[PDB]
Assembly symmetry: D3
């Protein structure tokens, strides 16, 4: 059977049960090449899929595109093909003054400022990572020598108003999000990104293990708009986290 | 002055104030070549951007990726660079027995089963197209010979549970969406897709003109499988139609 | 058959499948008399009902009263008696500085600041008109020589706090509506009225065709008390327009 | 001092601080003639207004029309003209088997199945009557010889789906209201009507005293078509009761 | 046979069908000793349970602890053992300048700023007392010589941010509650407490009779400190009043 | 110098403690404190019994919370005012997964917010999640004790009965929101029900406090609704050993 969007079969994955899921299709080959025997499988829309071998075990690398909706398709279709563990890596904007560019964040829970999470569980349900995955990501990030923060991430369906950016075409933010950055800062939230609420909610409510690690490329107390080094370190960390998840 | 995700500048757009926004980056060149002097501008992530000329006026073609969040970035960044009118095209399924594969749908309003629309306006606000764009799309669609339906589209943040698909890894659909397909069918909803609620709400609440036209490629109520010829013709017709709708908007 | 509130039977309607539905019972006779052979049918509560003939076809004119609840009863009972198309005409207060007193507005979608719409479809569903009715109303309004705006209307269950009026007994507006007029202005909303969200949602989710056209009698950025001759001229033009829109809907 | 809809001035009310507010404009004169020196003041739209005198004190009688939105206008405008106490009288459909046709109900709180109440207070706020008014209504109802029930009323923005009626044009009830009549029955709710949630919430949050008393004209567990003599008797007793409750409030 | 939290059996209650339910376990014995033959039954967690006799009839006194969740367990388990009427007593802080320390408040409805009420009825349902209990409490309170206020109480799941207290560890109040005290004050709300929304909603939707009476021991709007004597007298009066209200409820 | 409002202790009383163990039942406080050095009773008021003790030379406080988020929120706030920054919750729980056995322990990784008090600290979108260090310490302490330990999501309810979908109750009814909810949570992989974690974790995670929850399983809800009240002996003893060892790891 060949899934609707990803263009791969179960056989193509060579028994892989773990996927690393970056957002940018261009990052997929970079991650795969950190491992052994990388093989290009397919590319369609925002979904580029490779497989590789890590300590002799097959691993998939598959891009998600931006946002919960496109991520939800990739996760569902990979799960149909046997994948059970999902490691998200990406970039992020920090909102706490003490978090610096180049630091890494492992999400312990996400503020659900998305829509797709609600397609898996009502809002009351926590957007929480698998504890083993979060533990592996913390260990990999700390062992790398990075400065690592564990905490809550605000996960938004937009890059602009939902992250309270004003340098925009309208220069306006809807009532719901006015003052929201300060609110999240006061509540100890570490960072903004756009996929973790969907990923974590869908997996935690569907018997899949997931976690998120991100490299900080901007601090929103400094400016609104932004990283090559941070990105490179982040992907080395996620591969080491995958190594720790292998059985 | 280079936008963060799309990687283009205002000067790159050569004065374009109208964009055609398909979902699939591979479709961008296909639309652009229906116009004059198509030129590739950039490709970053799911965003492939071309410029072209239609009746002597610059037009942008930019893919959106799947879903409201990635669409919202492309529309915002294009608006920063002067684009004011957005014509969405794609292919779609339909959920009504009277809508056939190969037909076209022009959305008159969207059921907001998304999240990004709420980042622009509260749920009470209608996800509705600009009337001139919807009118241009209907006319272009009819002129192509297609059977055209005007009506409501259900716009979902998921392809699977939000469209009440059960053929999935878990086979479960959360309470909110159980029975939802029949509910929308009984309310006259024509089809599902994944971007219109965000696009229409963002634009209608931000001073931008938008509309959506789609070719029907599956019908959730029909067991039969559409033949390859029909599907090929439908994809080609859809992009011919959106370019003709753009021509009507530039007049 | 018979119905619970309107006091008319299917036979009374003489085969009418289209209704013009003003708010004020006193406007019913005025509208009917623009057509041929107007006949008074009944008056009970806020529901005054006439029949007339337009190009030889029976048309019913029925007042709705103020608000979604009373409108929902009239529409349901007219539908039980065979009516399938509903043309709303009324007065409105504009909220945009570029919309002048005496202009006309054809609603392309309503902000659902009502309660009755939720008795037909959840909030995500768009309060949008039938495209043919909206097209007919735009055409009739423009052909009359009026200045016509197509756009979003805020449809409120109250005249006072839900339209952010402070010159009231308490001078208070609940948190939900504080700052709301500025919010709708910034989102491009044209006007306030009190029935369109209910009417459009009910009809769009029930297989009925509906639209709304309105004459601007005040602008909220200006004064609250209309000038009498100006108001009379606007009201007269609005009912001429809605009758011409009905003519365009006849088959 | 004038108001926008009711067409009366403060002077017209002759110092009245209490209003009786039936729904049907035709009931206004019937209530007024139970008092001294009734005088017609105005009729505009669904608002018919009379003044009268009760034990030497001026009282106003003003119809509300159907639903919270039209009720909210009348209450606000009467409050602008000095009215501080509002006694609602109206018909109702009981939903409990132990409540008989011809009984009376005094509402102790309303289920807010409306929209206009939210324009005065968020949903958490209780739609509850002034305790003095409820007490006066219970006493007046009992003194008339009626069987009187105190309890919760479900107050709906629709007559049809929000009261879970299926004998309608579509025969559908939106998900929110499917099974709702059984749910309210099991929660001890007595009856349905369409104005109390708005009236009680707006008054309780605005420093106005309000209450509602109603005669039971049908029981939803029985039949929808009332017997004429029984209904006539119930309606006559209801208005005698509300006038006696007004007398008690003016003591 | 023995309820899980309260640790009592039906036989332990000696036929009681009425309970007085203070919050503080230390108050249970004090209330019981105002009646005849007080007998300690059990103490587990925040639940101290006594029985006593009032005019020859068995009455239960049972503490609830703080908050709706704790209260909901006590009410449920007592209802399993035959209790049908629940009289809540305590002391409270007022938010209206006209309410004085030493006055009594009888709740006519509660603002549902809790969570447990939603486990019995959706938010639309009114948190309202049984009319007989509220009537008995008003009579007992007035007969004591106290100044009594009938009105709305705001019932919060927190003591601190939900009552808009800023003198806290973080000094933060979440958006929902910023400005809320002034909002409730302007809407005429008398006081804050933490159990009535749950109690009243649970009982009103479950066929149980409930009400709440409280003595005012502090006023958020007055800067002075009440003296020890006045506070002592108010605490003593509140429990004498609830026992007299129980007397009025006995059949 | 101040004495907090409910707990009746001062900062000086805590001897520099920055960590609290917070069981629900006041009777459990001494039992936990005696596992440490130099336990001393500080205060008891309402459901709040407070001891201090020393663990590896560091002062620790043990404070009961009572049942539910509202009473828990008071204790946490007042302890934080006195310098406490880390909170370790221990309690009992009902498992809802068939593979979880009586006597197992559960460390909560996130809570389903079926409470009300959490909303007084953060909107519903915010995750009710523990501090990662506390959860890590609790898992290690639990494993080291020889217990079978589960990490996962906990449903945290404002009621013991309908919010945990118990039907062996006075009404035998569960409100629509909670009908079928146990099966839904089971299908979503939720491990267990309790009543305080959503409030505790949300309050702390949004207020700069570290918190976690560990619970001993005393019933499996796939088997029956009510625990025997005897299996709560060995399970309780091991649970408090575990929470003290988790505290040791945090210091
Ligand atoms: C840098 C960055 C990446 N992704 C986001 O969602 N927000 C940001 O600020
Ligand atoms: C065919 C199809 C395309 N896009 C969707 O979102 N749903 C569908 O069913
Ligand atoms: C003039 C006017 C009419 N109808 C409304 O609802 N609002 C207004 O301002
Ligand atoms: C009889 C009746 C009157 N009013 C209503 O709202 N419902 C009813 O059933
Ligand atoms: C005095 C007082 C008591 N109980 C509350 O809940 N709030 C208050 O202010
Ligand atoms: C045993 C048990 C304890 N606490 C709860 O909240 N639920 C349960 O089932
Ligand atoms: Na995407
Ligand atoms: Na009306
Ligand atoms: Na408690």
């Amino acid at each position: 059977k060949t899934v609707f969007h990803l263009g791969v079969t179960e056989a193509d994955l060579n028994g892989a049960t773990l996927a690393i899921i970056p957002g940018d299709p261009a990052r997929v080959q970079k991650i795969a090449e950190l491992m052994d025997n990388p093989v290009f499988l397919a590319s369609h829309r925002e979904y580029t899929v490779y497989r590789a071998e890590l300590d002799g075990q097959s691993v998939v690398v598959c891009s998600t595109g931006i946002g919960g909706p496109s991520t939800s398709i990739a996760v569902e279709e990979l799960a149909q093909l046997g994948v059970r563990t999902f490691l998200r890596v990406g970039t992020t904007g920090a909102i706490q003054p003490h978090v610096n560019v180049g630091d890494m964040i492992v999400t312990t829970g996400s503020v659900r400022l998305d829509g797709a999470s609600l397609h898996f569980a009502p809002m009351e349900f926590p957007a929480v990572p698998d504890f083993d995955v979060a533990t592996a990501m913390k260990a990999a990030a700390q062992e790398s020598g990075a400065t690592v923060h564990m905490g809550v991430t605000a996960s938004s369906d937009t890059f602009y108003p939902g992250q309270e950016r004003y340098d925009t075409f309208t220069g306006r933010v809807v009532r719901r999000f006015q003052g929201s950055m300060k609110e999240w800062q006061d509540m100890g939230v570490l960072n903004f990104e756009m996929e973790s609420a969907t990923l974590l909610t869908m997996c935690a409510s569907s018997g899949l293990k997931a976690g998120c690690v991100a490299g900080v490329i901007i601090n929103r107390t400094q400016k609104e708009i932004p990283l090559k080094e941070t990105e490179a370190r982040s992907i080395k960390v996620v591969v080491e986290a995958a190594r720790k998840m292998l059985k």
